[PDB]
Amino acid sequence: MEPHDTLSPAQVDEYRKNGFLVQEHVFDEEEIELLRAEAAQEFASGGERVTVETGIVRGVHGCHLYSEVFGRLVRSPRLLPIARQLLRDDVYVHQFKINAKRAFKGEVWEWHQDYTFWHHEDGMPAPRALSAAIFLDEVTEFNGPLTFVPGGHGSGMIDADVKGEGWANTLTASLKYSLDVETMRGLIERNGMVAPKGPRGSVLWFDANIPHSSVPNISPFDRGLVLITYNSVENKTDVTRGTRPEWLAARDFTPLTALQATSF
Amino acid sequence: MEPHDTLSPAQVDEYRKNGFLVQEHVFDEEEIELLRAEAAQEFASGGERVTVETGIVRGVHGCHLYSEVFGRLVRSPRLLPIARQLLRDDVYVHQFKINAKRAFKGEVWEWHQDYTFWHHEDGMPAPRALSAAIFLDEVTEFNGPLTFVPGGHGSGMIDADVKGEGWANTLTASLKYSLDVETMRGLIERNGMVAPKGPRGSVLWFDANIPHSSVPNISPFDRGLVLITYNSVENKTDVTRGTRPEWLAARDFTPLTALQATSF
Ligand code: PRO
Numbered sequence: 001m002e003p004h005d006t007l008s009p010a011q012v013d014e015y016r017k018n019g020f021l022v023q024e025h026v027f028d029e030e031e032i033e034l035l036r037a038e039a040a041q042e043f044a045s046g047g048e049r050v051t052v053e054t055g056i057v058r059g060v061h062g063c064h065l066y067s068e069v070f071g072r073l074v075r076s077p078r079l080l081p082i083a084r085q086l087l088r089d090d091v092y093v094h095q096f097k098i099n100a101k102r103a104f105k106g107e108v109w110e111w112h113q114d115y116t117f118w119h120h121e122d123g124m125p126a127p128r129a130l131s132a133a134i135f136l137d138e139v140t141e142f143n144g145p146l147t148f149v150p151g152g153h154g155s156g157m158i159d160a161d162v163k164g165e166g167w168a169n170t171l172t173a174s175l176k177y178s179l180d181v182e183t184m185r186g187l188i189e190r191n192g193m194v195a196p197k198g199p200r201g202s203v204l205w206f207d208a209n210i211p212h213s214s215v216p217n218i219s220p221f222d223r224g225l226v227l228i229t230y231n232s233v234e235n236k237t238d239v240t241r242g243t244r245p246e247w248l249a250a251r252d253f254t255p256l257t258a259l260q261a262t263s264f
Numbered sequence: 265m266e267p268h269d270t271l272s273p274a275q276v277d278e279y280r281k282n283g284f285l286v287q288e289h290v291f292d293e294e295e296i297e298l299l300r301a302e303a304a305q306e307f308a309s310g311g312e313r314v315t316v317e318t319g320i321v322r323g324v325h326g327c328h329l330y331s332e333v334f335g336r337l338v339r340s341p342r343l344l345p346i347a348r349q350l351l352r353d354d355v356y357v358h359q360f361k362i363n364a365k366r367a368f369k370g371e372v373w374e375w376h377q378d379y380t381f382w383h384h385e386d387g388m389p390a391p392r393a394l395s396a397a398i399f400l401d402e403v404t405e406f407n408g409p410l411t412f413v414p415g416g417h418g419s420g421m422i423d424a425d426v427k428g429e430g431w432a433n434t435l436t437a438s439l440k441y442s443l444d445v446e447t448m449r450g451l452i453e454r455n456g457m458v459a460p461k462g463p464r465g466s467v468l469w470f471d472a473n474i475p476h477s478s479v480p481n482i483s484p485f486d487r488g489l490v491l492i493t494y495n496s497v498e499n500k501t502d503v504t505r506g507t508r509p510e511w512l513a514a515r516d517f518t519p520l521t522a523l524q525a526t527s528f
Pocket residue numbers: 095112113114117118170171
């Protein structure tokens with residue numbers, strides 16, 4: 001395994017200022033293909049962990065608990081050291097999901113901050129968490145990229161429209177916690193909007209509290225993302241306020257260590 | 265009135281190669297405001313010429329036949345000379361519409377070529393026509409811009425999926441003539457995708473045969489377009505194959521002359 005990867009000090013500053021950062025070409029084509037094959041197996045076999053958009057498969061959750069490939073992936077030397085660097089802690093996986101947007105398909109995903117769900121549904125005490133979204137496909141202007149407000153995370157958590165009982169609607173557009181509208185307007189007047197792009201195999205890191213949204217893929221090309229949410233071990237969720245199963249909100253808080261090279 | 269405007273030879277070549285061209289800041293703010301006020305009056309008073317998206321007003325058609333402001337606009341020295349230059353003819357207005365996409369609203373508009381409707385529904389014999397879309401608001405990445413395939417018009421008209429009887433569904437997403445999918449894929453593999461941007465008051469010229477599409481406005485800002493379709497007088501539609509009213513497909517083929525300056 002290559003000496004553990006870390007972000008330069010410019011990259012860190014950029015991440016902290018903006019709330020997101022892209023690293024291009026972290027994984028190669030062959031690596032990505034292995035991940036897409038496994039994603040396809042998880043979509044086939046994940047049962048109640050799958051989510052469907054009038055639709056074929058949209059999301060699958062919790063895969064690192066069931067898939068040896070994905071269990072390894074979260075420990076990768078390409079990912080785990082950066083998670084540790086940005087969270088300034090040992091880390092574990094709170095949540096793992098795979099979100100596809102097939103060619104000419106997709107939905108408008110309502111503007112929202114991931115930490116609002118994790119705090120209220122799972123008992124996350126602070127927003128000392130982030131997500132790594134691995135691009136299974138090139139992310140362009142036209143296949144529904146994640147779209148952020150740069151610097152929007154500095155609001156902390158934002159008072160939010162609630163819709164629904166339990167958690168079923170946390171995985172749908174339509175979302176339980178959405179940002180409706182003066183909120184967004186001022187945000188965007190103050191801060192703007194950016195949809196980071198990148199080639200297949202890139203990684204997009206983003207803050208637990210950054211607002212984000214995405215639109216439909218009007219391209220003839222897919223937009224598959226594998227999203228790993230790392231949380232600080234010190235920031236472990238309070239399992240006594242927890243409302244969701246292990247494959248949405250982890251309860252094993254053992255600090256993660258990196259994969260090492262073996263002959264198999 | 266300023267000496268009639270025309271496109272430079274680079275601008276022309278760009279238009280003909282790509283199929284579209286933006287001129288920034290053609291109209292000033294005060295001019296645009298006059299146009300938005302009138303658009304709002306037309307949406308209020310246009311009756312059967314209006315179209316609504318579960319929605320408030322999306323489109324209004326034919327306005328230059330009913331509004332003195334819009335009747336003047338199509339004769340403007342900012343527009344008419346360029347229409348004449350690009351069509352290499354005297355011109356008239358085939359079609360006039362206003363398409364709004366309010367903040368956080370909008371639809372996916374299916375990929376399509378305008379000339380397919382005009383040929384089959386209206387009797388336009390050749391694609392020697394174009395549209396001028398005046399930006400009532402800044403057009404960005406995020407408020408559902410018109411999205412093209414650059415050079416896509418060089419296919420000529422493209423064999424197309426038909427859905428519906430009569431014309432009601434020519435003004436909706438969902439559209440009578442859409443480009444489904446190998447079509448789009450190869451197009452886009454060959455040619456790519458571009459969503460031209462620009463400030464309020466710009467003009468986007470595009471070819472009657474360019475493929476285009478747009479997605480929803482996830483911005484808190486509107487995207488109002490006033491679209492004037494100029495046709496070559498020599499290319500006048502064959503009114504004997506005509507199926508739609510005058511406010512969708514004009515029948516008065518009198519060549520247009522430019523507004524001149526008067527004291528009122
Ligand atoms: O429910 C959750 O935990 C994730 C976070 C944003 C939307 N779905």
